[PDB]
Design a protein around this ligand. Structure first.
Ligand code: CHL
Ligand code: CLA
Ligand code: CLA
Ligand code: CLA
Ligand code: CLA
Ligand code: CLA
Ligand code: CLA
Ligand code: CLA
Ligand SMILES: CC(/C=C/C=C(C)/C=C/[C@@]12O[C@]1(C)C[C@@H](O)CC2(C)C)=C\C=C\C=C(C)\C=C\C=C(C)\C=C\[C@@]12O[C@]1(C)C[C@@H](O)CC2(C)C
Ligand SMILES: CC1=C(/C=C/C(C)=C/C=C/C(C)=C\C=C/C=C(C)/C=C/C=C(C)/C=C/C2=C(C)CCCC2(C)C)C(C)(C)CCC1
Ligand SMILES: CCCCCCCCCCCCO[C@@H]1O[C@H](CO)[C@@H](O[C@H]2O[C@H](CO)[C@@H](O)[C@H](O)[C@H]2O)[C@H](O)[C@H]1O
Lengths: 193, 42, 154, 198, 97
């Protein structure tokens, strides 16, 4: 139960992975919408779980933060740098056409499959190590993925809001600024200018 | 007597008494606190 | 300042208006013996004029090129006295009146002849009910939560 | 005979006499509906308790400071002082903590007994009490929560709410501290009064 | 920079996507959405002499059913994207970061 003392919704019995009874707006009242929401929630969770380290790790290294790493495309002759290497295809129209064709193909492949249970957990080629072996352990891994991904989503929100509250920052730069003086470096200064 | 209080409770009479009191009040307030485009006490 | 205006304490046009007003009243004052009652009246209007302009200057009103106060209702905290604060006062009083009248109508609605108390006021009941308006925001909020504020299926 | 705030006046029917502090006082009929009465019982409890603590922390540090035993800023001047954290940080701390606790208490108001146990440690729960009087860890000395005990809690709470009102309005008109006001009054009472203060 | 290059690439990619990628989606949507109808019946059955769709042109020996209309639609897209990239490359426009 997400909120002790609160009656769980009628349609949330706790059986689903990551189902703690949280839908205060009753957005899953219709079952079709709820299933679609489980799929989409997992998609966001996995994009976030991939994108958070892609945001943090290049910052720990000498490379720019996640904001600076997008900046060459604003200027016309822009060329990307992967690990300091001016990659030749780094021009914006190149990687842009590449990204459109590749992403569009893959994601549209997800659009043209309706199991619907495979739209959440397809497996097969995407489970070569076969972690779907024990359905108990596979379901516990479902709770694992859902909580990890929700955590990553919250973290991403923290990164975007910190970026708005300190334009041209880094999550770890913000963290270090806090570690300097935690009692005088806080969200309190942003909430209260 | 009871009938007279009843008459004095009737809509137009109660209205003249009520708005006459309200007018005296607002007049005196504008007498001790004239002009005033704002609530100055903050 | 705000909206290109200037504080009335800093406005030449504002002070020119005060000057021309006072000199106008003094032009009227030159006609009467200084001990006379018309004279004392024009002096009272003059003192009231100075009080007016000095108060508008003090309380921070902005002026236009016209030399006249303009009100900032955007919500800027420097000017809540120009709308937001008198506005909250108004909403308190209006809510009071309407809440009391509604209390009266509910109180007489199950009488044998309801209209009878609408044209001849039950003044004792009204006096009992007038001071419910003091706490009208709590009463109306509690009714909204309890479902007693709005009639069902109307 | 449960006590009359107005001797001649009768009690509202909805004030049974089972509530502590029931002197038959609801002239604007705010508690006529029973759910309103429950909610306002909790509201009077919390406003009264916070008012007791606040009145204490406003008045006693002042009288101590003026005696000279310690040196503490005035309750209104305490905010401007320098502290080991930015006041914004202090605020965010206070807000997060109160946001947790108050919502647990509220869960008890809506669904009594629902939040009685530690959600971390599944042991160390609370005993079943009444709404607004949590037992267990909240009563370490294990005093008996009876009438006259609750009635004294409510009485001191009401006197302290009135007290706080007097503190803020007083300080507004006089520009000083409450104990400073008491000294000024005891000095020459017939010539030091709200009459002369205005 | 070379118009024939960009137009040929964009139009070839558009025809390609419409042929091997988005064809099934296209057909299931144009099938479930169906022909426009007035008063519960198609415009031609309702009596509009000119509302009969042209089944001759829609027949194609292309195995999947890709026809002249598909060519026209996707090729139109490819030319609009193509002249978009062409016109946008010769701009010299650059936003101030
Ligand atoms: C819960 C009630 C509460 C009340 C009644 C007040 C009242 C006050 N605070 Mg205060 N505060 C309160 C809570 C809190 N304050 C602060 C932080 C501050 C600061 C940082 C300051 C005040 C100040 C003030 C005073 C503003 C001057 C005034 O009113 O002059 C009539 C005032 C007496 C100001 C002050 O001390 O002015 C002398 C000031 O600078 N408060 C925090 C923590 C963030 C609070 C948390 O609950
Ligand atoms: C909580 C009880 C309490 C106590 C015992 C006092 C005591 C005092 N007040 Mg205060 N005051 C109170 C509440 C109280 N006040 C409240 C609720 C308000 C908000 C309206 C004020 C606002 C106020 C102002 C504006 C001033 C005082 C002033 C004073 C001092 C002189 C009295 C006076 O001038 O007129 C008293 C003024 C009142 C408003 C009285 C209201 C108190 C009500 C009636 C409750 C008291 C009744 C109680 C049963 C009798 C005493 C019980 C007590 C022993 C607990 C005096 C030491 C003056 C001062 O500070 O001296 C410079 C003054 O200027 N008070
Ligand atoms: C878009 C991402 C997304 C999606 C699609 C879902 C989908 C779902 N969630 Mg999940 N969740 C999310 C994000 C998401 N969640 C995040 C970020 C957290 C961490 C706080 C959680 C934590 C969580 C818990 C604990 C639970 C769920 C549950 C559910 C399921 C039932 C609730 C529902 O149907 O609402 C559907 C949701 C939507 C249609 C998305 C609406 C988004 C609105 C329009 C905007 C939101 C604004 C947002 C607050 C912005 C603030 C950020 C910042 C700018 C301030 C459902 C399949 C419940 C469940 O049963 O699990 C299976 C449950 O127990 N979620
Ligand atoms: C879907 C998730 C995601 C996305 C959208 C990105 C996107 C990006 N990454 Mg990141 N990254 C990710 C995940 C992701 N990454 C993960 C999981 C890791 C850990 C292995 C990294 C570690 C990483 C490094 C070390 C670097 C980037 C860099 C970059 C930027 C340029 C990459 C490039 O030059 O060509 C594509 C790269 C390959 C095909 C290889 C680019 C915006 C570069 C950067 O920091 O920008 C300057 C950089 O060098 N990423
Ligand atoms: C802690 C995060 C987490 C967790 C617990 C899970 C859990 C699960 N996933 Mg999921 N997933 C995740 C993240 C996660 N996923 C990410 C980031 C992606 C990429 C978008 C996916 C995409 C995905 C797909 C497509 C599928 C699953 C599947 C599954 C289920 C069975 C397979 C399995 O257990 O994998 C075990 C997971 C681990 C042992 C975690 C290993 C973590 C290490 C450190 C790798 C990280 C390295 C680096 C940081 C990231 C780069 C890797 C990248 C290049 C691939 C299971 C419930 C399959 C399924 O549905 O089963 C039927 C399946 O089809 N996941
Ligand atoms: C404070 C108490 C607490 C407790 C009792 C647990 C307990 C548990 N957690 Mg959780 N977790 C916690 C705090 C806690 N967590 C917090 C504060 C966060 C925020 C970061 C998380 C986020 C988290 C993630 C991301 C995951 C868990 C998971 C799990 C379970 C897996 C344990 C295991 O090793 O595999 C048996 C387990 C029952 C995993 C799970 O899915 O549960 C099955 C998982 O992936 N937890
Ligand atoms: C909706 C239209 C409207 C509005 C917003 C106003 C607003 C105002 N008028 Mg105007 N007026 C109007 C229409 C309007 N008037 C009309 C139709 C006429 C012709 C009859 C007039 C003729 C008029 C004159 C002749 C004067 C005003 C004045 C005023 C100001 C008086 C403020 C005051 O009384 O002090 C404050 C009053 C209170 C706080 C009373 C409320 C308190 C209650 C009674 C008790 C609260 C207990 C808690 C005020 C800003 C006076 C002024 O000086 O202008 C600056 C003035 O001289 N009005
Ligand atoms: C909710 C009630 C409350 C709150 C809002 C405060 C607030 C405050 N007190 Mg006070 N105080 C209170 C009740 C309260 N007091 C009580 C009941 C007493 C005993 C009667 C005191 C006696 C007291 C003294 C002697 C001092 C303060 C001090 C302070 C200030 C320093 C912050 C602090 O206390 O450090 C952190 C608080 C912890 C509990 C840790 C602060 C504004 C100190 C001060 O003046 O700071 C400049 C100071 O020395 N207070
Ligand atoms: C919570 C409260 C005060 C709390 C004060 C606090 C925490 C003080 C905190 C701090 O001081 C510290 C400690 C340290 C300082 O340095 C800083 C500050 C910040 C100063 C007062 C409540 C005060 C609450 C009050 C005064 C409530 C009064 C309600 C009344 C009189 C209602 C009466 C009626 O409603 C009935 C019952 C029946 C109806 O029918 C008729 C009417 C008349 C409507
Ligand atoms: C036989 C065959 C084949 C081949 C085919 C081909 C070769 C094709 C062609 C096709 C094509 C190649 C097509 C195209 C195109 C189309 C279209 C339809 C177009 C268009 C255009 C437009 C529409 C334009 C517009 C505009 C203008 C006019 C002006 C301005 C600019 C713009 C753009 C706007 C294969 C082997 C594969 C297979 C088997 C069979
Ligand atoms: C009623 C229940 C809830 C009540 C909640 C009340 C919240 C009150 C929030 C108070 C906000 C604190 O506001 C903040 O205070 C600090 C501390 O003095 C001020 O800070 C001031 O003193 C500090 C002392 O070092 C200096 O660093 C600073 O230059 C100066 O401005 C900030 O300028 C002000 O923005």
């Amino acid at each position: 139960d997400w909120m002790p003392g609160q009656p769980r919704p009628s349609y949330l019995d706790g059986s689903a992975p990551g189902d703690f009874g949280f839908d205060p707006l009753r957005l899953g009242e219709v079952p079709e919408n709820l299933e679609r929401f489980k799929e989409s929630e997992l998609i966001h969770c996995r994009w976030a779980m991939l994108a958070v380290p892609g945001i943090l790790v290049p910052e720990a290294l000498g490379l720019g933060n996640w904001v600076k790493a997008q900046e060459w495309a604003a200027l016309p002759g822009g060329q990307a740098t992967y690990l300091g290497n001016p990659v030749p295809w780094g021009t914006l129209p190149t990687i842009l056409v590449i990204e459109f064709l590749s992403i569009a193909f893959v994601e549209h492949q997800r659009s043209m499959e309706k199991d619907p249970e495979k739209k959440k957990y397809p497996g097969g080629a995407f489970d070569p190590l076969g972690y779907s072996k024990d359905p108990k352990k596979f379901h516990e891994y479902k709770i694992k993925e859902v909580k990890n991904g929700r955590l990553a989503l919250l973290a991403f929100v923290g990164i975007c809001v910190q970026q708005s509250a300190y334009p041209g920052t880094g999550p770890l730069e913000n963290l270090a600024t806090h570690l300097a003086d935690p009692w005088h470096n806080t969200i309190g200064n942003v909430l209260i200018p | 007597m009871r009938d007279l209080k009843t008459y004095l409770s009737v809509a137009p009479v109660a209205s003249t008494l009520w708005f006459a009191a309200l007018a005296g009040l607002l007049i005196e307030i504008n007498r001790f606190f004239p002009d005033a485009l704002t609530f100055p006490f903050f | 300042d705000i909206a290109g205006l200037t504080p009335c304490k800093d406005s030449k046009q504002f002070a020119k208006r005060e000057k021309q007003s006072i000199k106008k009243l003094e032009s009227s004052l030159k006609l009467y013996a200084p001990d006379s009652a018309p004279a004392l009246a024009i002096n009272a209007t003059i003192e009231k004029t100075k009080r007016r302009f000095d108060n508008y200057g003090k309380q921070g009103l902005l002026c236009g090129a016209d030399g006249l106060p303009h009100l900032i209702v955007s919500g800027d905290q420097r000017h809540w006295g120009e709308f937001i604060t008198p506005g909250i006062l108004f909403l308190y009083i209006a809510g009071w009146i309407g809440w009391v009248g509604r209390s009266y109508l509910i109180a007489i609605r199950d009488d044998k002849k309801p209209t009878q108390k609408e044209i001849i006021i039950d003044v004792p009941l009204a006096t009992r009910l007038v001071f419910r308006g003091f706490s009208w925001p709590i009463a109306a909020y509690r009714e909204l939560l309890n479902g007693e504020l709005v009639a069902k299926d109307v | 005979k449960k006590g009359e705030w107005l001797p001649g006046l009768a009690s509202p029917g909805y004030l049974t006499g089972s509530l502590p502090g029931d002197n038959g006082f609801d002239p604007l009929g705010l508690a006529e509906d029973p759910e309103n009465l429950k909610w306002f019982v909790q509201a009077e409890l919390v406003n009264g308790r916070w008012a007791m603590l606040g009145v204490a922390g406003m008045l006693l540090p002042e009288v101590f400071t003026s005696i000279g035993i310690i040196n503490v800023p005035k309750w209104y001047d305490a905010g401007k002082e320098e502290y080991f954290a930015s006041s914004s940080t202090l605020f965010v701390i206070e807000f997060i903590l109160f946001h947790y606790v108050e919502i647990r208490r509220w869960q008890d108001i809506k669904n009594p007994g629902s939040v009685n146990q530690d959600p971390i440690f599944k042991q160390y729960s609370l005993p079943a009490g009444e709404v607004g009087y949590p037992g267990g860890i909240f009563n370490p000395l294990n005093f008996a929560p009876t009438l006259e005990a609750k009635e004294k809690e409510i009485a001191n709470g009401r006197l302290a709410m009135l007290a706080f009102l007097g503190f803020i309005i007083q300080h507004n008109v006089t520009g000083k501290g409450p104990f400073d006001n008491l000294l000024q009054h005891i000095s020459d009472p017939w010539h030091n009064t709200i009459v002369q203060t205005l | 920079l070379n118009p024939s290059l960009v137009i040929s690439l964009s139009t070839g990619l558009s025809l390609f996507l419409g042929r091997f990628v988005f064809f099934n989606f296209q057909r299931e949507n144009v099938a479930k959405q169906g022909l426009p109808e007035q008063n519960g019946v198609t415009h031609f059955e309702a009596g509009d002499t000119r509302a009969k769709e042209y089944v001759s042109l829609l027949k194609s020996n292309d195995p999947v059913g890709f026809n002249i209309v598909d060519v026209l639609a996707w090729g139109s897209i490819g030319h609009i994207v193509a002249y978009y990239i062409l016109a946008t490359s010769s701009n010299g426009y650059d936003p101030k970061f």
